[PDB]
Amino acid sequence: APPIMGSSVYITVELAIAVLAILGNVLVCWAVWLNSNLQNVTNYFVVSLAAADILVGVLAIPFAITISTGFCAACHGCLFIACFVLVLAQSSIFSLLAIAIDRYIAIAIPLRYNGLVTGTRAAGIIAICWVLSFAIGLTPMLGWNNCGQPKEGKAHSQGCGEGQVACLFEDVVPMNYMVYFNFFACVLVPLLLMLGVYLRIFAAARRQLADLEDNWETLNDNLKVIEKADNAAQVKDALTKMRAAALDAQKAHGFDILVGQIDDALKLANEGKVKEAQAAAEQLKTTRNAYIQKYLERARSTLQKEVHAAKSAAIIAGLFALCWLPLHIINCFTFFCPDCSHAPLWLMYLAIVLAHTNSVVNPFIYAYRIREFRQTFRKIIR
Ligand SMILES: CC(C)CCC[C@@H](C)[C@H]1CC[C@H]2[C@@H]3CC=C4C[C@@H](O)CC[C@]4(C)[C@H]3CC[C@]12C
Ligand SMILES: CC(C)CCC[C@@H](C)[C@H]1CC[C@H]2[C@@H]3CC=C4C[C@@H](O)CC[C@]4(C)[C@H]3CC[C@]12C
Ligand SMILES: CC(C)CCC[C@@H](C)[C@H]1CC[C@H]2[C@@H]3CC=C4C[C@@H](O)CC[C@]4(C)[C@H]3CC[C@]12C
Ligand SMILES: Nc1nc(NCCc2ccc(O)cc2)nc2nc(-c3ccco3)nn12
Ligand SMILES: CCCCCCCC/C=C\CCCCCCCC(=O)O
Ligand SMILES: CCCCCCCC/C=C\CCCCCCCC(=O)O
Ligand SMILES: CCCCCCCC/C=C\CCCCCCCC(=O)O
Ligand code: NA
Incomplete structure (x- = not known):
């Protein structure tokens, strides 16, 4: 029953995920950097995706641990912590969509591919996708939020100062x-x-x-x-x-x-x-x-x-x-x-953990499925 025990499990699991997401996706970036055979437009989207997964470990997971406590915060600060992961998920979606289109051009119009699909155009697409991801993920900060309808009973019961809310995801994000x-x-x-x-x-x-x-x-x-x-x-x-x-x-x-x-x-x-x-x-x-x-x-x-x-x-x-x-x-x-009745808390946290786990898995798929990555991983690990 004591909340710290269940919290301890969830935090421990989150931190294990973060370590693994950081380490495997750093290896991905390292392999593309080091091996010119991996320096192609397809893999620039791969790196953008790995960068998103690194930031899941470095920021989104610490933010998720933080918001699980319901700490008192200014509501708009709380929104940022709550929503930053939506930026990362959106960037991941754009990168995945880009990879799919890239492979389609390559198989469907190979004559024209290298002509149409350049590293410079790819870098520009990636910048744009990151900007769009920020705007989509942080849209609640533009006013689509519950900050005008704070839960003042929670705020008071937690001891929050004037104008703060208990920072809980479903309380602030509509x-x-x-x-x-x-x-x-x-x-x-x-x-x-x-x-x-x-x-x-x-x-x-x-x-x-x-x-x-x-x-x-x-x-x-x-x-x-x-x-x-x-x-x-x-x-x-x-x-x-x-x-x-x-x-x-x-x-x-x-x-x-x-x-x-x-x-x-x-x-x-x-x-x-x-x-x-x-x-x-x-x-x-x-x-x-x-x-x-x-x-x-x-x-x-x-x-x-x-x-x-x-x-x-x-x-x-x-x-x-x-x-x-x-x-x-x-x-x-x-x-x-x-x-x-609301999905129970253990299931909410299981679903959060599962979503974060996505940031660990790509490096394994690259190693099992793409010899150039696997071979480059091996040499790096030495
Ligand atoms: C370059 C990287 C490492 C920068 C990371 C900065 C992060 C940790 C900063 C940027 C904005 C910050 C938030 C801004 C406003 C508030 C409201 C306050 O009532 C509680 C803290 C809180 C919620 C801050 C927490 C920390 C925060 C999320
Ligand atoms: C580390 C290098 C690369 C970038 C610099 C990041 C600095 C500016 C970040 C890292 C952690 C951040 C802090 C994390 C938590 C809090 C508590 C909050 O209530 C006020 C802001 C404050 C105090 C943040 C201020 C900015 C901060 C110190
Ligand atoms: C793995 C992917 C493809 C499918 C996962 C489906 C999951 C998320 C589904 C399957 C059964 C679903 C549950 C069925 C019944 C209830 C009771 C309701 O009062 C709250 C929602 C809740 C608790 C659902 C939450 C979502 C749920 C757990
Ligand atoms: N619903 C939800 N809740 C949370 N955290 C709050 C979990 C919770 C839910 C209810 C409660 O009383 C206390 C805590 N994070 C969440 N992240 C997301 C999310 C990200 C992408 C899609 O959904 N949804 N989401
Ligand atoms: C507090 C959150 C904001 C500060 C943390 C840093 C935010 C990082 C934001 C965007 C990072 C985008 C990096 C994209 C890498 C592209 C990879 C490539 O060149 O192919
Ligand atoms: C990212 C590299 C730079 C180093 C990161 C800075 C370290 C910050 C880590 C955790 C911040 C802990 C904030 C909680 C302390 C406040 C608790 C309180 O007194 O209310
Ligand atoms: C190499 C270091 C890797 C870990 C870096 C972690 C950076 C910390 C990021 C976010 C921590 C946010 C915690 C906010 C605490 C608010 C406390 C309060 O408002 O009272
Ligand atoms: Na991702």
Whole structure:
């Protein structure tokens, strides 16, 4: 029963989280700094996210411990302590959304990617996102707060001085802000947009892969057609099919040998020399073994690497949602069901701890899923 015992557990757990969030995310920043292979726009958003998680350990967690005491404070000071974590969560959402878009450009418009997506533009986007996060997270300080309706019975019972309140989250931060503005508009909508981006990434990868396969099968089918010695009409028609595919494959080294060899055979076939056109087409089986098989396999593995990277990013976004959703959902109960008894205090604190735990997990996901990070972590730890 004595409040200090339960508080001791919660504070201890918070501090353990803070240590881990600081240490793992410092390692992330260190790895990007040290390894030029990791210096790319995608990972500038990774660093912005790690910076947000570092600040969860250095500031948000000390603020959360502080506000759990209900200490007397000027209400607007209390608001800052209460809301600063919403800045960090918002910055995390922007960084996650940026990463998802980045991976979409990369898989969907790779020709243009490095042209569109530069480190200087990325740095500007990150600055903007941080500014917007401050404005979203600290909106209660602009007047959308309960500071005009203080709980004077709590204030008095705690001994607070004139004009102070007991600094408690749900006393000062309006739930309509938390539910409608923060959760629905600022969190859930970005998360649904993120989900839509990832679904478009995986559909674009699957489509490009199937086209690689279709274009390859077309080459091989049209060859068997030619060997089914029909008319010059046939050979011609199969070679035209092959040439088109060959450009879809190229347009999308030895493609010149390939298209030349097709053109050579097309001339023979357009001149009614079926057997020499057939003989001419058989040289294709060699250019295909020596060049086109190789281009296909490399294109396949480049794709898979990008699917792999996109899944890693999606995992991080999904873990952000898992960790933060319980708090938002509880707030919905508090707001929408005044007839419901309030979620109990142990559960509130469990949900807070769970949200903070999100700031620990990304460095593990990078180490398990991204060899360049893992390898750089290892060398740093030495
Ligand atoms: C660069 C970093 C380390 C700066 C951190 C500054 C933090 C700790 C400062 C900045 C603003 C400060 C708050 C400003 C106003 C008040 C109201 C007062 O009645 C109680 C203290 C309280 C709630 C302060 C607590 C400490 C505070 C949150
Ligand atoms: C440490 C370097 C990098 C930055 C400087 C941070 C300084 C200015 C911060 C760190 C901790 C802060 C203090 C934390 C707590 C309180 C109690 C509050 O009732 C009044 C403000 C006061 C006294 C803060 C004043 C500003 C403060 C001293
Ligand atoms: C892990 C993620 C994906 C889902 C988590 C769902 C959690 C947050 C849900 C599942 C069951 C829910 C509880 C069901 C019943 C009540 C009683 C009500 O008087 C207050 C809210 C409270 C206590 C709910 C709080 C939120 C709750 C704990
Ligand atoms: N509802 C809520 N409460 C708290 N702390 C107060 C927990 C509490 C709730 C009731 C009470 O009588 C005493 C303490 N922090 C909170 N943080 C958040 C939050 C951040 C992001 C989404 O929700 N919600 N939230
Ligand atoms: C009292 C709270 C305010 C004082 C504490 C410091 C506030 C820090 C605010 C914003 C930090 C933004 C850092 C973003 C790092 C970007 C990483 C990158 O360059 O890719
Ligand atoms: C961030 C690096 C700089 C060092 C941080 C400064 C250290 C401040 C840490 C804790 C502040 C403790 C405030 C509580 C004491 C006041 C209690 C009271 O008498 O009412
Ligand atoms: C290397 C140091 C790492 C830890 C730094 C922690 C910085 C402390 C940040 C916020 C503490 C805020 C506590 C406010 C106490 C208010 C007390 C009062 O108003 O009476
Ligand atoms: Na985060």
